[PDB]
Design an enzyme around this catalytic site. Structure first.
Site, PDB file in Angstrom:
ATOM      1  N   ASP A  99       3.064  -5.734   2.177  1.00  0.00           N
ATOM      2  CA  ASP A  99       1.771  -5.207   2.587  1.00  0.00           C
ATOM      3  C   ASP A  99       1.894  -3.765   3.072  1.00  0.00           C
ATOM      4  O   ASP A  99       1.664  -2.822   2.300  1.00  0.00           O
ATOM      5  CB  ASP A  99       1.148  -6.088   3.672  1.00  0.00           C
ATOM      6  N   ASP A 100       2.265  -3.573   4.336  1.00  0.00           N
ATOM      7  CA  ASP A 100       2.355  -2.250   4.953  1.00  0.00           C
ATOM      8  C   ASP A 100       3.702  -2.138   5.658  1.00  0.00           C
ATOM      9  O   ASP A 100       3.803  -2.364   6.870  1.00  0.00           O
ATOM     10  CB  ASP A 100       1.201  -2.011   5.926  1.00  0.00           C
ATOM     11  N   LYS A 118      -7.460  -1.567  15.600  1.00  0.00           N
ATOM     12  CA  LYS A 118      -6.257  -0.914  16.103  1.00  0.00           C
ATOM     13  C   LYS A 118      -5.221  -0.730  15.003  1.00  0.00           C
ATOM     14  O   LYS A 118      -4.431   0.222  15.053  1.00  0.00           O
ATOM     15  CB  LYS A 118      -5.677  -1.718  17.265  1.00  0.00           C
ATOM     16  N   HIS A 161       0.826  -1.192   0.000  1.00  0.00           N
ATOM     17  CA  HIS A 161       0.000   0.000   0.000  1.00  0.00           C
ATOM     18  C   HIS A 161       0.869   1.253   0.000  1.00  0.00           C
ATOM     19  O   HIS A 161       1.865   1.337   0.737  1.00  0.00           O
ATOM     20  CB  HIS A 161      -0.922   0.021   1.215  1.00  0.00           C
ATOM     21  N   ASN A 180      -6.029  -0.036  11.837  1.00  0.00           N
ATOM     22  CA  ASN A 180      -6.496   1.135  11.105  1.00  0.00           C
ATOM     23  C   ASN A 180      -6.088   2.421  11.817  1.00  0.00           C
ATOM     24  O   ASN A 180      -5.771   3.426  11.169  1.00  0.00           O
ATOM     25  CB  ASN A 180      -8.012   1.082  10.930  1.00  0.00           C
ATOM     26  N   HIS A 222      -2.889 -12.465   0.307  1.00  0.00           N
ATOM     27  CA  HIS A 222      -3.122 -13.255   1.506  1.00  0.00           C
ATOM     28  C   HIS A 222      -3.564 -14.671   1.141  1.00  0.00           C
ATOM     29  O   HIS A 222      -2.712 -15.535   0.882  1.00  0.00           O
ATOM     30  CB  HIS A 222      -4.156 -12.584   2.416  1.00  0.00           C
ATOM     31  N   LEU A 259       5.251   0.352   6.705  1.00  0.00           N
ATOM     32  CA  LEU A 259       5.237   1.321   7.797  1.00  0.00           C
ATOM     33  C   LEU A 259       4.874   0.661   9.122  1.00  0.00           C
ATOM     34  O   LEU A 259       5.496   0.932  10.151  1.00  0.00           O
ATOM     35  CB  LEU A 259       4.250   2.451   7.481  1.00  0.00           C
ATOM     36  N   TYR A 267      -2.711   4.264  10.984  1.00  0.00           N
ATOM     37  CA  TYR A 267      -2.560   5.155   9.840  1.00  0.00           C
ATOM     38  C   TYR A 267      -2.623   6.626  10.230  1.00  0.00           C
ATOM     39  O   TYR A 267      -2.342   7.482   9.387  1.00  0.00           O
ATOM     40  CB  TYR A 267      -3.633   4.839   8.795  1.00  0.00           C
TER      41      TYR A 267
HETATM   42 ZN   LIG Z   1      -2.954  -5.299   2.066  1.00  0.00          ZN
END
Ligand SMILES: [Zn+2]
Ligand SMILES: Nc1ncnc2c1ncn2[C@@H]1O[C@H](COP(=O)(O)O)[C@@H](O)[C@H]1O
Ligand SMILES: [Zn+2]
Ligand SMILES: [Zn+2]
EC number: 3.5.4.6
Lengths: 619, 621, 614
Positions: A518-519, A243, A174, A245, A463, A521, A248
């Site tokens: 994925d993320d 949590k 993302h 979400n 996934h 961060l 961000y």
């Molecule tokens: Zn994702």
């Protein structure tokens, strides 16, 4: 090397079950594959050539800087076609007569779904597929024991090629989290100095500079730390997607998310574009690493596509190592509850009508026309663990009639994204423009039947953890060679522990799996999250060098990069099936490994198809 | 403030007083043995442990820029002679200088007590129960205090995991560079100079390109796979294969050219590779390493040859400390007729050091180099079996002429004995003293951990402590540092999910993370960060746990007191929370407080048990 | 006395008061919901939980030898009529004032609990508390296990072999082991050589003739031939498990031997149960709660089941009966055997209501119900659900589609009709019933929401490990859970993954059961085999084993008189006062620890709420 020791089974009933059980499973398996092949053909999405060749025997019919200048005058002319959404799908008109596009029939889709829904709970077929999955793992284990030395020798003998100079694609990442926490912290603290008077936020009608934003929070540049941002997933985030979400919002601040992590804000997404381009610089410096970032089109406003395109064009957010995929959060209930949307149809219109308008009249949306050159497909994201109380069928309200504040189920989002995308691809194909694919998040958590939806409509998924609970679905994904972009580090911090992750079994059994961050961060700690992702997996599951390169090759194959780019990456013959499409000089994957996978897939497809033709009916 | 777990009852250990008394007496006796030898060798001993024992004890400008011997400290005119494997100092180069020369019979006597202790079933169960209690208490502490610990980390300004000091407490210089880094260096060298002579084969001088031409390997064709210096799954339980990974492209000549300090080019290539790595550590600022340099004891001039290599090539960094490793390869040297006896090996390792201390101008470059050398290490395949038990019947080093390699305890004792005398002499002149930090417990006999417990400041690996509850219990009470390399263990001996590191950290043992051999194991450009990542993900370590490990790494390090004052604060020498500053460590005082109280409570439990018996034995006699 | 662990600090629960207060209010509200429906149906509610809740609400919270209808209580002349799926009693054949359940109130309660089970903040809180309970027990055992064993050794006479164990969850159709079934079948083939046991396409056959058609002799028959034992191929294949009910894969053999209604009037099935009953009586201390099937297909099933038990004297002092209703409405509707779901409900409850009003009309049923304690629901719980039970759902009379009603649909109407039946039976002084369904074995987690509201206790309950708030609520409510690790190992969850050790460690009222000895166990004593494997695998202490036995008795439906003889006269007391080691072999240290832990947890939740109410 090419020749290798091969495992063969002699005697009758080579599959380990009586023929009567084999025939029943084969009939269902073939029918399921035909269903997927139909919708892939309908939406101009890819279908596995190897599967298609074996299914053709039983088939009634034959199967199968850019942003420097933005001049609408030189763009392709207007076709004058009319547009109107009918029952949740965009229809094209001569100006008037309907253009004969293959508009999906919902009743046909529901009927196909019911077949798969009954299949995934079929006991006897479940046992058969589970036995075959165990067989694939056993055969791969034998192949490794008898050929890993030969595979390693081939990797050793290849000139120049090693894991560090093979192409690797972050197939699932993302944009809002593509940077590491330290990178985000440094960027913010640099921005607090360079420009000091620019208005970056309006609080209750009060224009504020970045310094005034931080003074309202009683925070100094020195005081800021990675802990202060609190954007890293911890052990307390496990089984708490809510949590996650919240991560961000830096420092628990939606304003900081707006300023630095949003494309549309008072600064015209200035900060977000700069951070992405810094990530692009690192990707280009590494040369061999690529990513497929996810940008958000919420469908809340009709102007989102144009504003996103202008954002990319004005800030020159482009890189040869970056492909764009547009993600649509499943947040209709939030929008409807706030009165920001009238019905689900309005959300669909804000997502697809600008795209259809750009195709027919490129000069109508000149920035979008250029931007779509780098947009490959659509994604669907939300807390997949949330329960579903509504079944998508013919009794469901149509999008225009869906006015309740209830969020439509996963299949509801997917079908209408698929249906509109399929019509869009047909229209864009006629003009020679780039087509799109559907690549949703699926199988991370929640109901297993989400994977039924993706099997019918999705080019590939991310996934896909729940395939371990559905042997028939996992078996079908193997037979169809459906790509799976997995993120073990993300799963370990949210849903499934690393040691229980099913990726090792998928890879051994021959599923087209690839690794992704994925993320970065919220999860990774190093300056190269993708290498860190490869590291943890290679150590915990003790993956061999051949396994690592095979994953890298899979990542390229399931990516949205162009044929020309892939030809340089994998060789001009990469589109061929089996070893012929593999060049160890470019992939570092021995043909022994590729040969084993191709033979194993061919043997499995031959078993199913030959069983169907072997049936003897009695008058 | 934080929530504290307290026990309420008559017997709060879980065992009858007889079981507690038996274990406590042996544990206290074992701790006294370690304290005696740490004091003898001027090595650190846990201040908290000593304070509890006292109650039961009747006794109370680049550094290598210039090399001018004239400005160095003068000669003391002291004679040196190795007697029974230990150096003796004499007034003239004449009377024997009164130094605490170790007595082997005393050492053997202490060993026998510990050897009997490690097989004592009743004591073993007691310690195992206490270890389970330590794990249980930490789990409850985490459940009832992790949120408060996290809040403190959020509150402190500027301080996070990325700006706290981290020390790679256990890393070898010969493998400190990643595989991709080494490949790039090799490819660059082939281009630059054809002038260099790197290897002579059968008296035939060869250049770097000629050496590669003999193998018919071009620069372009070369790849990481060709180097084959990476440990794969085939290396598991195969240390000999790991030994082969030290040869690039499976060639010993390439190892000499690029990876060794002494060669035809004066080890220039190896120095540049290290200095390139040193640059990255300086760029990262907060990352430091304790690289292991090899002194084989094969030649008397190795120490001078290693010192000149550092001085001439200016191999120094403020973020790098040197620990000298002695591979246990006496058998290899003796079999080849390169050493007369084991005494010669000890002399080659220790005589130059004593001479340099006495007469710095005699070894001017060694005197400068030792400013950054902190201690000694012993490395070898610890899985190798031992057929000889180190005892008084064992041959003395001068009498050891057989080609058999001495056992692990033989190496450690004589390294310890000579080091202790060297430290005493160096202290007299005010020079920096050394510590003994050996590889121990990775594999092989359990009693290796007995030897280190007596003589080692801290150890590396230490996996086998999980198989000896009494030793693990003692290491916790003595707070003996353990440098653990989970990635190295995963590819060589023990898998990540079986690694005892999470149990050690939870129970309060001073553990730190290390890379060991980044060349053979890591894939990223920041191996230490990669090591921390994998451990944090597999064991779901919190931010507090990560910072606590980083704090332990600094404490276990050989960095100076002044350096640690800036890193950890001026009061870092204090015990317990008083010595912790979140503004420099990012470690909440809640965590340090819990550890300090738990350690004191455990010591109190053992100390009171010993006092109780001695109180009740007074009427008995 | 025992070493106790105490927590000192400002936030002894481990979270800020704001998080504690929010979770406590929902937890208290959930407990009140269960208490309301338990009181409505006359089912038990944990006394310890009730006491801590009262502060938050001022409002108060051989028997079959002779069958003489004349001697039975007279007819009350009360009318019966189904009203929206629930039987209503009338003064003649005005409405009798019974607390008829309100569906809207039930739906509203369900929605609150469904929201709670997906509430993230409350889920983390409950999970933290569950980990605390496990950690506290771990510390307790480390410091007190020696003291607990010493008490067990010091108490005279009593040991694990002379304490009462109740098989709280076992099916009659599978109550015998495979070798026992094989011996019985061979025994029968040599007896009653002239008697029709089955008709095959209009051809009467004797027992021998049936085996002649199958080409099998008595000697040929073996345990392998019957194929009634589950194996690795039965895993996650409950349909294969049902197929195991047919010996030699023949439905006829199941009908002859393993059914109460057949040509021989269920002669053989009664005999096998009596043989098991005899083995149970010889053991003295081992008991069972067998499940008998009332399918609700025909109105006469209750009378025919009662006649079967009375005529064959299928009774034992060591056996209590629970009646199971398979969730097979879809099968019956598809075949035309029922018109609507209300008819199924009518077949299940109307005979019971008629028997209560007019015992002489169902004389055999009146005697049989004396030994029937409750109802059970059984089916492949892994099957998905596509319909949600709410006010929009069809009423039972309007449910005519072949789709099987969801789990909550079965449970509510069984609960609603049962509750009214209990109220009527209490008025006449007759024995009342309880609802003890299978729940949590597999399938949707929300099944455990339904049982939490409506069930006295449950069996299996494996999915509680995936629902922190539900497991925390079950612990606080002390809902009995009858677990069958061996059955789960062969069907859904492997033995090493079974959550039983976690539930037992955290203080949940768990008991061990065999479920289906025919399909699972190998030894002559399935219950002892079940206990042994659990002890070996999880290294359970003698105290742990005896605590499980005590829990099994407490969960059981045995009378107060019998339990007083078993556990002592004061067993109804809470905490250690209700425990007698001479009768249970459970040290008061263990019982004391459980009671203190439960009270402390309840105080934390209730006292937090009171602060807002204070
Ligand atoms: Zn994702
Ligand atoms: N991590 C290690 N473990 C065990 N022995 C080692 C290690 N490193 C070096 N050695 C030994 O030390 C000698 C080589 O030292 P060096 O050239 O610096 O690598 C060889 O005998 C190796 O077996
Ligand atoms: Zn090492
Ligand atoms: Zn059951």
């Amino acid at each position: 090397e090419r020749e290798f020791q091969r495992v063969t089974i002699s005697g009758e009933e080579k599959c380990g079950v009586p023929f009567t059980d084999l025939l029943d499973a084969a009939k269902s398996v073939v029918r399921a594959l035909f269903i997927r092949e139909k919708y892939m053909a309908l939406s101009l999405q890819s279908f596995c050539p190897t599967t298609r060749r074996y299914l053709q025997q039983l088939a009634e019919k034959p199967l199968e800087h850019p942003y420097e200048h933005c001049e609408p005058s030189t763009m392709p002319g207007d076709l004058g076609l009319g547009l109107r959404m009918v029952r949740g799908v965009v229809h094209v008109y001569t100006r008037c007569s309907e253009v004969e596009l293959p508009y999906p029939d919902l009743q046909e889709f529901v009927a196909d779904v019911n077949v798969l829904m009954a299949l995934i709970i079929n006991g006897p077929i479940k046992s058969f597929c589970y036995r075959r999955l165990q067989y694939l793992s056993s055969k791969f284990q034998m192949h490794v024991l008898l050929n890993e030395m030969k595979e390693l020798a081939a990797q050793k003998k290849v000139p120049h090629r090693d894991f560090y100079n093979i192409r690797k694609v972050d197939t699932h990442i993302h944009a809002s989290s593509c940077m590491n926490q330290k990178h985000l912290l440094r960027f913010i603290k640099r921005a607090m100095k360079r420009h000091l008077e620019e208005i970056v936020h309006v609080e209750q009608g009060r224009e504020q500079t970045l310094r005034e934003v931080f003074e309202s929070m009683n925070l100094t540049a020195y005081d800021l730390s990675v802990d202060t941002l609190d954007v890293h997933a911890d052990r307390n985030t496990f089984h708490r997607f809510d949590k996650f979400n919240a991560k961000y919002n830096p420092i628990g601040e939606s304003v900081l998310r707006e300023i630095f992590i949003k494309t549309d804000n008072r600064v015209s997404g200035k900060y977000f574009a700069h951070i992405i381009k810094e990530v692009m610089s690192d990707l280009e410096e590494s040369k061999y690493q690529n990513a497929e970032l996810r940008l958000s089109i919420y469908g809340r406003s009709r102007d989102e596509w144009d504003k996103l395109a202008r954002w990319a064009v004005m800030h020159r957010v482009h890189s040869p190592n970056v492909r764009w995929l547009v993600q649509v959060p499943r947040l209709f209930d939030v929008y409807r509850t706030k009165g920001q949307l009238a019905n689900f149809q309005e959300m669909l219109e804000n997502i697809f009508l600008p795209l259809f308008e750009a195709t027919v009249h490129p000069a109508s949306h000149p920035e979008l026309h250029l931007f779509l050159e780098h947009v490959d497909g659509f994604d669907s994201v939300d807390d997949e663990s949330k329960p579903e109380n509504h079944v998508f069928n013919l009794e469901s309200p149509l999008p225009e009639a869906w006015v309740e504040e209830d969020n439509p189920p996963y299949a509801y989002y997917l079908y209408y994204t698929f249906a509109n995308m399929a019509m869009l691809n047909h229209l864009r194909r006629q003009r020679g423009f780039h087509t799109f694919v559907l690549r949703p998040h699926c199988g991370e958590a929640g109901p297993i039947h989400h994977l039924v939806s993706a099997f019918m409509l999705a080019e590939n998924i991310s996934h896909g953890l729940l395939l371990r609970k559905a042997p028939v679905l996992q078996y079908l994904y193997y037979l169809a060679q459906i790509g799976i972009a997995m993120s073990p580090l993300s799963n370990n911090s949210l849903f499934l522990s690393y040691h229980r992750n099913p990726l090792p079994e998928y890879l051994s059994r021959g599923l087209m799996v690839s690794l992704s961050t994925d993320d970065p961060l919220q999860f990774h700690f190093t300056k190269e999250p993708l290498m860190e992702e490869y590291s943890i997996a290679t150590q915990v599951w003790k993956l061999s060098s051949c396994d690592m390169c095979e994953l890298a090759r899979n990542s390229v194959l399931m990516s949205g990069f162009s044929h020309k780019v892939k030809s340089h990456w994998l060789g001009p013959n990469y589109t061929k099936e089996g070893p012929e499409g593999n060049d160890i000089r470019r992939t570092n994957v021995p043909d022994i490994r590729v040969g084993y996978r191709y033979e194993t897939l061919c043997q499995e497809l031959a078993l199913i198809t030959q069983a169907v033709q072997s049936e003897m009916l009695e008058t």
